[PDB]
């Protein structure tokens, strides 16, 4: 699975 | 910070 | 599971 | 052998 | 940020 | 000199 | 500086 | 294509 | 088999 | 302590 | 197939 | 310091 890096600013990760 | 791995049944992450 | 870097460009980390 | 990051939770090197 | 493996004993992902 | 992942969104090896 | 993936077929990396 | 850290001695990254 | 961390100074670099 | 990849050519892994 | 760091004054990548 | 990968067959570490 992707383990996406986003910024909800600072980092914040989603894994899909 | 650092990274959590948890479970979710994947494993799924957060940053604390 | 593993935690593998991979690219396809990117570089990326892969949850497996 | 192959040095991969491993998780079941924590995170180690696993040595295959 | 930097993303960096670290110990204190398991391995962590620390964001710098 | 230090390869170090970074993410600022994408990852990437940085050169240190 | 940071490593660049490209395609040249196969990956090939830079520095830049 | 998958980065694998590896080593059979040096550490070597390979790219499958 | 997986690497564990020991530490106090100076790192050690138990096997499992 | 960091665990951080490093080169001067071979790859190797720092504890710092 | 490997990444080569080698020596060309800076630091070069190469895949094989 | 940094992580040594020595043949005991097996690969081993040791810190250095
Ligand atoms: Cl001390
Ligand atoms: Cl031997």
């Avoid at 699975?1 to 899909?16: G, H, M, P, Q, R």
């Amino acid at each position: 699975a992707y383990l996406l890096f986003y910024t909800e600013a600072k980092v914040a990760l989603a894994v899909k």
